[PDB]
Amino acid sequence: ASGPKSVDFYQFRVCSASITGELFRFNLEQTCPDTKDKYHQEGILLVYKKNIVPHIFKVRRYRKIATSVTVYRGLTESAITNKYELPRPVPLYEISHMDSTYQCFSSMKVNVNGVENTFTDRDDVNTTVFLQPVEGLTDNIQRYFSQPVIYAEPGWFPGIYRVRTTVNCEIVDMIARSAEPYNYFVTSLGDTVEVSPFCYNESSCSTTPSNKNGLSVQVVLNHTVVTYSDRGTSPTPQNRIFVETGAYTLSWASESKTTAVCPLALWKTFPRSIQTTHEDSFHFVANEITATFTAPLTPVANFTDTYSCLTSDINTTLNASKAKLASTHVPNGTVQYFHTTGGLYLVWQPMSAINGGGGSTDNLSYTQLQFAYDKLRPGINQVLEELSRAWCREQVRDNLMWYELSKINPTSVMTAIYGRPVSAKFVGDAISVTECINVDQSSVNIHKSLRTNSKDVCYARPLVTFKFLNSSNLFTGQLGARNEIILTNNQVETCKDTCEHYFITRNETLVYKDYAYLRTINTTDISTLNTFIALNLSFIQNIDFKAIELYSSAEKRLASSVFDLETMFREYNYYTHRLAGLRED
Amino acid sequence: ASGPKSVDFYQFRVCSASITGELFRFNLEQTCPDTKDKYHQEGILLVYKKNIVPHIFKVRRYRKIATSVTVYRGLTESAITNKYELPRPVPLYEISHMDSTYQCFSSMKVNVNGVENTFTDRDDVNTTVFLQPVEGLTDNIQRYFSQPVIYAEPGWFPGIYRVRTTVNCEIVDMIARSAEPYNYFVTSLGDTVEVSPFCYNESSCSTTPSNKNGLSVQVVLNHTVVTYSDRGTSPTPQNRIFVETGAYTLSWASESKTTAVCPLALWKTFPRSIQTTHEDSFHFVANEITATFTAPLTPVANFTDTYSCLTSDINTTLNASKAKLASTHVPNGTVQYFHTTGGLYLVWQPMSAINGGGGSTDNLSYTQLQFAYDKLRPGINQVLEELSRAWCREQVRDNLMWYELSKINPTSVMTAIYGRPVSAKFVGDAISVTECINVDQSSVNIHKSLRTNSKDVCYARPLVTFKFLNSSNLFTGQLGARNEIILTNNQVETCKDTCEHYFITRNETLVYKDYAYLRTINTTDISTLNTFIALNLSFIQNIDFKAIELYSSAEKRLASSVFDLETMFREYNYYTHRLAGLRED
Amino acid sequence: ASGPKSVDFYQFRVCSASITGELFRFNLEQTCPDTKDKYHQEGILLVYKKNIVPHIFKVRRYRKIATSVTVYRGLTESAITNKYELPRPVPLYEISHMDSTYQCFSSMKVNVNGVENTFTDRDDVNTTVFLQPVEGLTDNIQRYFSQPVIYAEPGWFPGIYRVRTTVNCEIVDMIARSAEPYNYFVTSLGDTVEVSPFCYNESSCSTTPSNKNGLSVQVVLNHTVVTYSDRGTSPTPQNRIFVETGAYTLSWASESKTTAVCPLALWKTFPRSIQTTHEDSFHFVANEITATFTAPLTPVANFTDTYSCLTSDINTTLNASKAKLASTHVPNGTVQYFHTTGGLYLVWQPMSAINGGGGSTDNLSYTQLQFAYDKLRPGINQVLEELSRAWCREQVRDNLMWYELSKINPTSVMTAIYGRPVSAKFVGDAISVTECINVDQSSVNIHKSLRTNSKDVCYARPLVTFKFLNSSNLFTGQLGARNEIILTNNQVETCKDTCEHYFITRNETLVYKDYAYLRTINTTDISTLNTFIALNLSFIQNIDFKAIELYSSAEKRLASSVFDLETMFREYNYYTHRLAGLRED
Ligand SMILES: *[C@@H]1O[C@H](CO)[C@@H](O[C@@H]2O[C@H](CO)[C@@H](O[C@@H]3O[C@H](CO[C@H]4O[C@H](CO[C@H]5O[C@H](CO)[C@@H](O)[C@H](O)[C@@H]5O[C@H]5O[C@H](CO)[C@@H](O)[C@H](O)[C@@H]5O)[C@@H](O)[C@H](O[C@H]5O[C@H](CO)[C@@H](O)[C@H](O)[C@@H]5O)[C@@H]4O)[C@@H](O)[C@H](O[C@H]4O[C@H](CO)[C@@H](O)[C@H](O)[C@@H]4O)[C@@H]3O)[C@H](O)[C@H]2NC(C)=O)[C@H](O)[C@H]1NC(C)=O
Ligand SMILES: *[C@@H]1O[C@H](CO)[C@@H](O[C@@H]2O[C@H](CO)[C@@H](O)[C@H](O)[C@H]2NC(C)=O)[C@H](O)[C@H]1NC(C)=O
Ligand SMILES: *[C@@H]1O[C@H](CO)[C@@H](O[C@@H]2O[C@H](CO)[C@@H](O)[C@H](O)[C@H]2NC(C)=O)[C@H](O)[C@H]1NC(C)=O
Ligand SMILES: *[C@@H]1O[C@H](CO)[C@@H](O[C@@H]2O[C@H](CO)[C@@H](O)[C@H](O)[C@H]2NC(C)=O)[C@H](O)[C@H]1NC(C)=O
Ligand SMILES: *[C@@H]1O[C@H](CO)[C@@H](O)[C@H](O)[C@H]1NC(C)=O
Ligand SMILES: *[C@@H]1O[C@H](CO)[C@@H](O)[C@H](O)[C@H]1NC(C)=O
Ligand SMILES: *[C@@H]1O[C@H](CO)[C@@H](O)[C@H](O)[C@H]1NC(C)=O
Ligand SMILES: *[C@@H]1O[C@H](CO)[C@@H](O)[C@H](O)[C@H]1NC(C)=O
Ligand SMILES: *[C@@H]1O[C@H](CO)[C@@H](O)[C@H](O)[C@H]1NC(C)=O
Ligand SMILES: *[C@@H]1O[C@H](CO)[C@@H](O)[C@H](O)[C@H]1NC(C)=O
Ligand SMILES: *[C@@H]1O[C@H](CO)[C@@H](O)[C@H](O)[C@H]1NC(C)=O
Ligand SMILES: *[C@@H]1O[C@H](CO)[C@@H](O)[C@H](O)[C@H]1NC(C)=O
């Protein structure tokens, strides 16, 4: 026969399983994979923020005030011409009684350029007097005075001046505060003190007085101070620091830096949370917040030596949390510490069923967006695994439908599983498969008649005459299948009174009736069955998100204070220099 | 026959539908479910923020200023030695003319410790004088003066001092402001007044003067004030409050708290929005913002009595919104009020087609994340419903393919629908199904030949000899199907010149040709057809989100003011106490 | 025959392909669509923020201070009665030497109301003296003085006063700053200057002095200033501005507005980013941030003329970025500029493989939420395209299973592809299809027996007698299929000893055995096969997101300063007016 093997359904061809081809078998007894197993670890999670508030402590301020008024007796009239005020500090010989028993000496002495000035209340004798309270606006501040009334009696002889002078003792009790570098502190009344509040424990002080330009500093040991309930059951001794600036004395009780302040504070605690491991990081889940916190794969070393000041709090918080779960869970592993990109610190303790970034970010939105994405992702990936084993259990039945169809005739199954024409035959329980041979398009002609030379026999398919490539002798058969040449003839039972056919070729159809040919008609004129099932899936669609604000930048400005400092200081400078000042003309 | 029933395809067995087994029927005329119906309610949504700005009102301040300068005539030279200033309040006998006609009395009297001081401009006679404007830096502040020039003429006789004195009247017109507890207010020039701005309507005042330490307070009825356009068409009478602190008099017009301020403000309004009900909450949708607001299932009671001050605004806003939709929608139900976790208040009005949390959260990101999640979720759940009815319409056709295959032989369909060997037979329009019986593995032997004792008949399957368990007599048949024993023989039409077979057993294959046995070969040597269609689905993948900031914490600090208050007050204290002050040595 | 065509399987009917009906063909040689192609453009992206920091520059302040002290010699005692201070500006004849060589004239003259006052240090002669440094608290401020010590020696004769007077020269070197409208500037020590810092380049100044109420302003050309290293290699000349307010002289070096400040600053640069086009906008992607920025479809015009001050920076940044990619990419198109809703500006440069909104939003969360949504959406839409071509390749095999089943008998395939009974016949390679005819329910009766009048022939289906609508003559056949009447009879091979049947009708079943009828039984008593495969898909579920804060509104307040301005100014007003002031009684 001819050389070229068939590769499409368009050329005329001769097929036969007449040779020892390749053998195939239906591989029955398949199975789909089983359901996977998935696991996770529970534990206690504690979350730490970096601290932000200033340090806050109580202080006392001691002063003596000298005042001088100039008055003019005049005649039938009198006036104040001036009033001057001079504050000064208080020495330790007096602070003793002034904080013990609320007494002071009604007079003062002031060295200036090496000469001694003196001031005495109402020009009377140096004598001891008692301090008493005065009313206040703000409940955290208390104030005590020795003499509420300024002296301005005009005097007895007409036409000349006199000077009137007074002395006060003052105590104030109030708050003071300071921030991260601890170089200085600021008092509630606005006094700025320029000494570190821990300075004795940093060994920057002594019982012998220290000195600086504009300061003297000392520590007094076993000092005692009495509350104005003024009662003999005196408070316990302390060590107290004393600062003697120009214009006042100030004092506070000594304390250590590492007991006073620690850099971190507890934000929240979750007694049930889960750890999952990814390619580059760990994820820790907090359901009550709707958030997840991530961290690098390596825990932070030395969190017992750096931040050692937390060792009071993590132990009691883990011990209380473990005692709450002790009926259902028991600890595993050991305590671990992690630092989140974003600036938070995590404490973790694994549980089993019993059966750096100093710029801490203020906005936590990325922790909630991670929780939403990690709830969508496994919810979608579970549908893909449930869809894929429902598909595989169908392909195991399709392979049995093709097996039962193959026992009827195996050729029509092989040219359905392959995309190309082949011929096939059973040789036992295995199927032998074989190539098919092309025949030339020009030797092929189809006969115009179907009734036989016998009186009552009719061909069910039209006769065809042909020859192979590179040959002279002719051959004949019947037009079979799509465009096949069949070598063995077949017939209808009788040439019954009426008959019709529409034989189909690759392009055209031949129409026959009364056992003879009539016309050639295009195949597209015959209507075609549709057996397909439509999906009509609708795809996800685009959204543009918007920038939104609850309060305007102006409303955020006006809410910050009732004071308008930007205009308050501009008017004070304009008034005191241009309007009210001495001015040339 | 033997007792044990077949449970796999590996042991040799005898099957027959020779007994009255159970009956089965193909249940034709199935259907898939129909498409569901889904519904939602439209309405108008108004959203309220808690208010944040201070209260703002106009005030007047009245003062008299006495000044005294000391000058020294000297000889061939002269200098100022001192300048002192004394502000005082203004009494009602003068405020009358001073706010009516812009006049004041050019002199003042000052009681101190029970004696009367007097100050007069340039030592001249007590006389009436007119106030006039002066220029200002800030456009909200106006200032008026009676005498712009301070007096410092040195005098005529050498070598002795003199005192020069002046008196001013001042008015200032300006803003003042106050915040949430309303205990006090602060003036634009920095004066703090320590009285509540509504105090007469709270019955904390009277027409008889009230008193406090450092204050006097009074209400004046039917008071009148004239604008500096100074024109006879005088403004309408008012009730005005007067405060007389040390150093000034201050006044403002009386007003009621419930007309002055209300705690909430309207943020946005949506004329088309949708309500959906979930297991624990309601969700309200705003498309123009790309956001959704949630609330508890119970509306807030008494929002007409608490927040009654909004009853002017919600009525006109709902009436305008309803009139905008009146061509396509008509109201249903009644107005309802809800409080969102996050601190916003919602107003809702249902429409039909015609056919607490005082910590208000500043960042609205959770409202946009809820809108994105509620756009993904129903978009994915719609694909699952469209995929599930496309699958069911295919299973209704697979059930018809198995029916048409069963009419050819029902055994091969029953052992495809069940996972196990059984035998089956039609008894009418119903199929009778029956168990199959195991035979021992040791009595089975397969014959080495296929040609019969007849001269031209050949067996299509090899002969087998066997016996049942607990028996002596032998039996024979043909090797059928996978590993079956068949009791009725079958043959090929003729012993044609050439023949070949590859019979398959559970492990091994037997090869025969020329109608006799030759070899045993492993089944895995025969190539197997693959008819499966691959899915190749690709799963969703992990993303790590990052912390991001547009401006540094330092840039947010430097943007807050041009004033550097942290260093401005430190230098003023250092200069006035250490550098410039009187200092001992 | 009767008129009504069959529309269900419930009525009895007669079917035959006895007429020339419509022709159908199996449309083989189908294909599914091929895989789509998808494309995107890479480029360099630069992102610009609006600037927020104030302008910052160096200044000098020059002063002369006159002081006067009053002291009383007295007897056996002495005291200070007053101390007064008077600051004044410095004239250009002196600023020359004072900034060149650090010298000043130890005396001053002060015009007031047209008469000249004079002050001289310690009453000594007018002489030149040298300035020297003093220590400072804050490292950005330097201060120089001519006389550190105030003079207060009491004097020699008992019982009378004397006045002591001193003069200082002061220089201060420090920072000053100003903001967006540029109307004024504020010095580090709190001095507010009320002149624009660029005023000479805006032609608001001259070398002839300008004047305002309370100011004089001048520009000095080629001025020179010497650093206190005080060395003959003098710095280069400048043009310097001079302001002469009351109480001081102040100076700064002249500069142009367009070189000093530009409104925008570079935030980040991405050398690989991608542009995608949507229905109304463009999206630009930044992977290292996990964010995408959107913009309108039209680029902004005139960004080379408005914001021309950026032309130094975008050129060098694009040139450096292009040189980094020059081994793998080459430029295409040209540079384009876009303005994002949210207030950022984008610069874009396309690359190829070689082979307005002044309210800038501070919170970028919407840019990360867009990146998450645009990672979910194409990840889900890819699964729908991979699922849809896996479905289509199966429907192309189902169409071949129906073709092979149709060659056995075409009726049972046509009533599976249609939902209704029809009859069909092959007329060649095409199938002729025909309607079926209803018969009345009352003429139908089923015979009680199956054995024939012949001695050993039995009917496989029971006999039926019937007639057509509007007729008298009777007909007979066999009960076939579901509820069909068949006109041609068929039989079992022999009336074998035992036989049983369960014939099924639309409601009831008839049971027969020993070739005769016995009972009528409901069809539901016969057990039915189940061949369906379950999906068990589980749908996505609802989540309620929460409002979260890292720091309380109180902690955000307390972190803003160590100063408590809200109480500091309230106590100063209470103390100086009520407690310490002159008060009537
Ligand atoms: C105690 O005693 C001391 C003295 O020991 C007193 O100090 C004296 O104070 C008086 C005023 O009270 C001074 O009198 C006045 O002098 C000025 C300056 O005159 C000279 O400079 C003028 C400007 O030239 C500048 O620019 C040129 C370049 O163009 C430059 O070369 C100069 O160096 C100069 O300075 C500038 O450049 C410097 C270097 O870069 C800079 O540092 C500097 O800041 C400048 O930028 C110049 O025009 C003038 O020439 C004319 O006038 C002089 C007289 O001064 C005359 O001799 C010439 O013939 C010219 O006609 C000088 O070179 C001067 O300008 C003043 O004149 C004005 O004011 C009067 C009214 O007072 C008007 O009538 C005039 O019209 C004019 O407006 C005045 O003469 C005195 O000089 C000064 N002495 C010293 C040593 O400095 C102190 O006041 C006493 N205190 C008490 C309390 O008693
Ligand atoms: C500063 O204060 C700390 C805390 O009080 C001191 O540390 C203590 O030192 C004593 C003696 O070694 C120990 O017994 C305590 O346990 C320590 N406490 C802590 C918390 O450290 C420290 O010695 C002080 N330093 C100085 C020099 O005063
Ligand atoms: C405080 O002000 C309110 C508001 O003006 C006063 O309430 C009014 O009272 C009158 C008389 O009963 C009513 O007619 C008005 O309708 C009320 N208005 C409102 C808005 O309440 C209240 O009486 C005043 N209280 C005092 C004591 O002055
Ligand atoms: C203000 O300053 C700007 C910048 O120095 C001046 O503009 C310059 O003008 C000169 C002369 O035309 C040009 O050669 C420069 O190229 C310009 N530079 C810039 C950046 O503009 C401007 O002339 C000044 N205006 C005045 C009146 O002084
Ligand atoms: C005819 O059939 C051939 C394939 O053999 C096809 O390529 C062509 O498009 C068809 N149409 C005609 C009639 O050319
Ligand atoms: C926790 O419990 C253990 C065992 O009682 C105890 O030793 C430890 O001090 C506790 N830690 C704290 C402080 O909670
Ligand atoms: C042989 O078949 C049995 C099942 O009957 C199977 O378990 C075994 O793995 C197969 N292989 C052999 C030859 O043991
Ligand atoms: C709304 O309209 C009704 C009917 O006109 C009216 O009674 C009611 O006062 C209106 N409310 C407001 C203030 O909008
Ligand atoms: C109000 O809403 C309910 C529920 O949707 C509906 O049954 C009823 O008909 C509506 N009535 C009006 C007035 O639209
Ligand atoms: C009987 O069959 C009819 C359809 O022909 C059906 O509508 C009905 O529900 C069935 N049940 C009976 C016995 O009524
Ligand atoms: C970029 O490079 C070109 C070519 O060298 C040059 O002309 C241009 O000035 C450069 N721009 C800058 C400033 O980077
Ligand atoms: C520029 O881009 C367009 C569109 O992708 C492309 O057709 C063209 O070839 C590109 N040219 C260069 C220079 O890469």
Author numbering:
A (entry chain B), B (entry chain C), C (entry chain A): 54 to 408, 448 to 677
Study text:
To alleviate this issue, we truncated the sequence and determined the structure of the soluble ectodomain of KSHV gB (amino acid residues 1–687). Of the homologous mutation sites at the DIII central helix, D470P was selected for structural determination for its expression level and charged sidechain. The structure of KSHV gB was determined at 3.3 Å resolution by single particle cryoEM. The gB structure was reconstructed as a homotrimer with C3 symmetry aligned along the long edge. KSHV gB ectodomain exhibits an elongated rod-shaped architecture with dimensions approximately 70 Å by 70 Å by 170 Å, consistent with the postfusion conformation observed in other herpesvirus fusion proteins, such as those from HSV-1, VZV, HCMV, and EBV. The KSHV gB follows a canonical postfusion domain organization of the class III fusion protein, with its core comprising three β-strand-rich modular domains (DI, DII, and DIV) and a long three-helix bundle of DIII. Of the 13 hypothetical glycosylation sites per protomer based on consensus sequence in KSHV gB, 10 sites displayed the densities for glycan chains. Notably, the glycan at N179 showed an extended sugar chain density, corresponding to up to eight sugar molecules, including two branching points. In general, the folds of each domain are nearly identical between herpesvirus species, but we observe that a loop in DI of KSHV gB at residues 252–270 deviates greatly from all currently known gB structures. The DIV trimer region exhibits a rotational movement around the three-fold symmetry axis, while the remaining ectodomain (DI-DIII, DV) remains largely static.
